Design a protein around this ligand. Structure first.
Ligand SMILES: [Zn+2]
Ligand SMILES: [Zn+2]
Lengths: 59, 505, 146, 134, 505
């Protein structure tokens, strides 16, 4: 499994993959609820994506 | 030499640094001399000039003392102009002409300044943004600004992550960046990507003219030979605080319409610029023609961006800055991919405004009273403004002028404008997200890149969105897939919305 | 005010379809005191009267606004039957000051979802379910008044 | 009454009577007159005094245009919900109304003396009800 | 030998005779012996038989004694049949086989009866009706009934005007008639009318099947070569008093559906008859098609005939028997001429029904009490019926049973009865024409439908009038301008379109 956490990859139930993915990328600061585990297609060896939600600030 | 808008920059830093204290932070800035150094190679070409322009535009919005270091005599003229640029942003800013006191340094061109401080060589070659910690990387000969400008953003982020390293986690300095803004992969020796700057943007709408839009405008004004009809839509005016983030605003633009600013900034392009000093909804209603071939979105709220998709433009580029991530998403509506509304579909119930407001003010138990005051929009009684200052740990007196005004006013002026933040030495954090200028600028560069690439007809991104975290080492994989909403509740599932789209396009 | 920003092709087809879905039922709605008085995108204007109360009293008149429908749920405003001007709850014979205009505290209604006290229950959680269609609003009002 | 005039005539006349009411709907609403249903040969109205608080349905009618305008229209007071004819405990003696001309007491005022004058059309009937009843 | 329906014939007489008195009148009839004489010329052709047939049909409806006089042995077969026809109408009629006692004689054929009583020779030739007071006129050889039948009506009228000469003014009998029912002008030797069994009615409607229709049906059933589809429409049944006027009703038809009778009247034609025991509105509604190719109206009130025009048939022939005339009118709608609604457009206001009934009750100023007793449907008090009986000039006793009953009851019986209590001085309001008026109007109606469906040139005036209580007019045609009020539906663009939509032009 390859989890791309905020663009940064890390090799590792499914909350087990996110927990070690957040521990490996030191991104455990943000609650795990704010993260969205997706597949290479974006659906809520393989490559998975542990990214945040899209943003609102821009002005 | 700290800028008159420094408290807003401190607000932004307070959301990314651990153990933040406002006195500490300004003191830290005051002990810095951030150097921009450059030689004949950088100043002799458009990519060099652009990198330097934006580096200074970003650094002067935060650091109280810069060193402007021309390394040969040809760079001297550019040095004077750069100094004038800095000062037009912060007239009290300090300029050093000597390198001995630099605490960190950015270098454009081919020459090493050989200073005793962390030094980051930045530059570009067309679509490629380049940064090295060890060797000069040079400026290319293209007339595109995307690589050159993105290089400045990465430069400014590394300056910030070097100086404040001890208050960041997993935030090492970048050693090497070679990133193509064409593909968002590592640049390759073959696929340089097309660099012809003669292109036409069609009839494009830029919605929102704030920080992100200033990065885009910065780029669109520096692509010589670009044609197009650009509609620029925002109803607001530049405020002092905005200079923390708005790379094309200086002291002289305080109080200017954001639509007029954007018009002036493009005056020397060949773009046909139509200024709409109105909100999107009023623009859309007066226009009375719902054909929007190309819309760039640079807004602040989910609702405002979703309202744009509701108009059913043919194609949208959406750009954002959030806490630990900036980016762009792209949307055709009838393309099997996620629409812009997909991006903001809510995942479940949340807390109401009365609760979150009550929590911020340190009174999570006067929810009922805050609910009434947000509906009646009545004046906050004296006994209320007294409670709030005590629960927040600040004096009553600075807040007394808000007694009697609407609670929304009291809240968004005292709290969201950072008055309680100053009074508490940065411990009472603002809930409104305030991005760093280098994030706003990069997001806007990427937005003008997408609009340009789209309008040249390039095959579009393999994924919906592209993301960047400038508070960390650049990622190895910036593409971010997003699946269409499958709840059934997004309008891209609606046959009426699909019909209205196919009718137009 | 709310300005029409959704492609009006969309909201006008949906409106036109809510009115079409209403027409075959109008007699049965009348039996409950529900009278469609005027329909003209984006507005549907109804009067309500208790069939079970003598003498017959107009107890409510609503303007239903379908601007930006159904990206935005519809607005329900209680108005005066003849002036067609909003009224205060003091003058109104799930509804929520007496000098303030009443609204329908309910998912599916714009005065609910835009109220700060319900920001946490966003409309897009409810879109496409029934809540916020004309019949959903008509049903609630018919059932408040009896 | 059974339709014996060519219905292309009466339908055309009724549709025009309706087209001509629509530009005035707002004005009539102001006076308390509301078109509820419209479908040849009937047009159903409800009435409410605008100055009577509480707002009260004072009358509902059915107006029939069968054999219009050779025969003048019938005006029946009905219950606003059931549409059923009502008793006076809850006909308009006026030329232009078929109940009046068919009353043997008014056999001396035949409708063909009035046809085409403005009596018997919809606006005429609505205006009489508005003025008297209120 | 007076008929069981004689009071209805007395009701009719009382409207034309001066100083009428019921008792005298019936006595005057009993002193008469009305002779029908005929020879081998008359019984040997279709015209002569038709003339005899109708003459007996008319005279048997009034005179209690007939003399049937065959003038040779050939005519003896027709004689028995004529006696049987007269008895089928009045079983107690008196039949004389001698003329020794005749008070008035009608003669068909060529032979003179040689009697001392007034004697009228009647006959025909095709379209021409012939009567002579001095010489036989003879009966032609065509198959046309119209002239032959009209001659009987002229025969019977002159009989009536001769017997009752002393109670009429300007009522001389006719000396000579040579009238063309084709042209309604004096019969010319060259100006004759076409004679051909080649006549198709297409799809024709005969509305009203009473007295006038009976004359029309008598004629059509003798029209040789008649083809087509004919609708006969009437909801009523034959009443005993109708035998005073309905030439095809005898004792055996009492009680029967007028629609079933009209059918059997035509059984010997080639017409496909559809009989409808309905009113016109129900006929129109059950057809759902408002195509009416040809309509013959034989009704009794303005409103009923006006309603027929409302349906907008292509062409109407309208037939009437009024007080001082009988006649026929012809109406296309979109031709510039008067329309059937024209013929009854009101010119002013009139007396209300409560008022007219107050005059008929001798209480002209109790109109308010007659309106109240009609609206309230209350019982007539005793003091009212004593007032009415005294105003009526009769004893109170016949009207005493009515004390306590609705006024509508009192008027529906005593008034619709008191004519007999007053020896004929109290006249009823409703005109009761004489049998010969009804028959001629019906012959004219059959004439028009056949001429119009044979496509002859149509009449120069809208209507044709005859007054059989005077010597025949020298100008029977009556012009009639299109109503010029604007209020007649023939002025209405919606009606004109619906007519062209169906029939063009
Ligand atoms: Zn979507
Ligand atoms: Zn006419």
């Amino acid at each position: 499994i390859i989890v791309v956490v905020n663009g940064q990859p890390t090799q590792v139930p499914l909350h087990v993959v996110r927990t070690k993915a957040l521990e490996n990328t030191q991104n455990v600061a943000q609650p795990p609820d704010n993260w969205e585990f997706k597949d290479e297609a974006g659906n809520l060896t393989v490559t998975l994506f542990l990214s945040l939600k899209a943003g609102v600030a821009g002005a | 030499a700290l800028a008159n808008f420094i408290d807003r920059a401190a607000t932004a830093a307070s959301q990314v640094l651990t153990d933040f204290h406002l006195g500490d932070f300004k003191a830290a800035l005051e002990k810095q001399v951030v150097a921009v150094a450059f030689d004949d190679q950088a100043i002799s070409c458009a990519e060099g000039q652009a990198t330097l322009d934006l580096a200074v535009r970003l650094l002067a919005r935060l650091y109280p003392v810069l060193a402007i270091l021309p390394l040969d005599s040809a760079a001297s003229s550019q040095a004077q102009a750069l100094e004038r640029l800095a000062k037009s942003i912060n007239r009290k800013i300090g300029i050093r002409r000597s390198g001995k006191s630099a605490t960190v340094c950015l270098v454009a061109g081919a020459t090493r300044p050989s200073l005793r401080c962390p030094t980051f060589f930045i530059g570009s070659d067309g679509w490629a943004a380049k940064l090295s910690r060890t060797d000069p990387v040079g400026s290319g000969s293209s007339l595109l600004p995307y690589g050159a400008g993105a290089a400045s953003c990465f430069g400014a982020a590394n300056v910030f992550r070097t100086i404040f390293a001890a208050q960041l986690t997993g935030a090492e300095s970048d050693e090497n960046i070679d990133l193509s803004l064409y593909s968002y992969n590592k640049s390759r020796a073959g696929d340089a990507g097309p660099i012809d700057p003669a292109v036409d943007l069609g009839e494009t709408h830029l919605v929102g003219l704030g920080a992100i839009a200033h990065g885009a405008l910065w780029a669109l004004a520096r692509q010589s030979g670009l044609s197009g009809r650009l509609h620029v839509v925002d109803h607001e005016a530049v405020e002092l605080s905005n200079l923390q983030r708005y790379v094309l605003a200086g002291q002289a633009e305080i109080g200017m319409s954001k639509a007029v600013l954007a018009t002036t900034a493009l005056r020397s392009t060949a773009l046909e610029v139509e200024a709409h000093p109105l909100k999107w909804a009023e623009h859309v209603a007066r226009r009375g023609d719902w054909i929007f071939d190309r819309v760039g979105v640079a807004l602040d709220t989910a609702a405002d961006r979703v309202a744009v998709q509701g108009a059913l433009p043919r194609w949208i580029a959406n750009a954002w800055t959030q806490e630990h991530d900036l980016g762009i998403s792209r949307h055709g509506f009838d393309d099997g991919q996620a629409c812009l509304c997909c991006m903001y579909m809510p995942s479940g119930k949340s807390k109401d405004e009365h609760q979150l407001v009550a929590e911020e003010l340190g009174i999570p138990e006067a929810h009922e009273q805050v609910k009434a005051l947000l509906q009646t929009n009545a004046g906050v009684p004296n006994d209320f403004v007294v409670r709030v200052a005590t629960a927040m740990g600040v004096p009553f007196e600075p807040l007394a002028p808000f007694v009697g005004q609407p609670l929304r006013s009291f809240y968004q002026q005292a709290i969201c404008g950072g008055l309680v933040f100053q009074l508490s030495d940065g411990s009472r954090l603002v809930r409104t997200v305030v991005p760093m200028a280098f994030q706003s600028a990069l997001a806007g560069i990427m937005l003008a890149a997408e609009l340009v690439k789209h309008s040249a007809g390039f095959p579009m991104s393999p994924t919906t969105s592209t993301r960047v975290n400038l508070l960390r080492p650049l990622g190895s994989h910036l593409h971010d897939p997003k699946a269409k909403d499958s709840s059934g509740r997004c309008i891209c599932s609606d046959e009426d919305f699909i019909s209205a789209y196919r009718r137009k396009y | 005010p709310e300005l029409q920003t959704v492609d009006p092709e969309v909201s006008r087809a949906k409106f036109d379809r809510e009115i079409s879905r209403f027409r075959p039922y109008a007699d049965a709605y009348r039996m409950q005191g529900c009278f469609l008085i005027e329909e003209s995108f984006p507005s549907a204007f109804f009067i309500f009267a208790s069939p079970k109360v003598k003498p017959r009293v107009i107890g409510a008149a609503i303007e239903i606004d379908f601007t930006n429908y159904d990206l935005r749920p519809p607005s329900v405003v209680f108005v005066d039957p003849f002036t067609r001007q909003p009224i205060a709850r003091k003058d109104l014979p799930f509804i929520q000051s007496l000098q303030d205009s009443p609204f329908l505290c309910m998912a599916g209604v714009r005065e609910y979802h835009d109220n700060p006290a319900h920001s946490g229950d966003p409309w897009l959680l409810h879109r496409g379910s029934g809540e916020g269609c004309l019949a959903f609003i008509l049903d609630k009002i018919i059932k408040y008044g009896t």
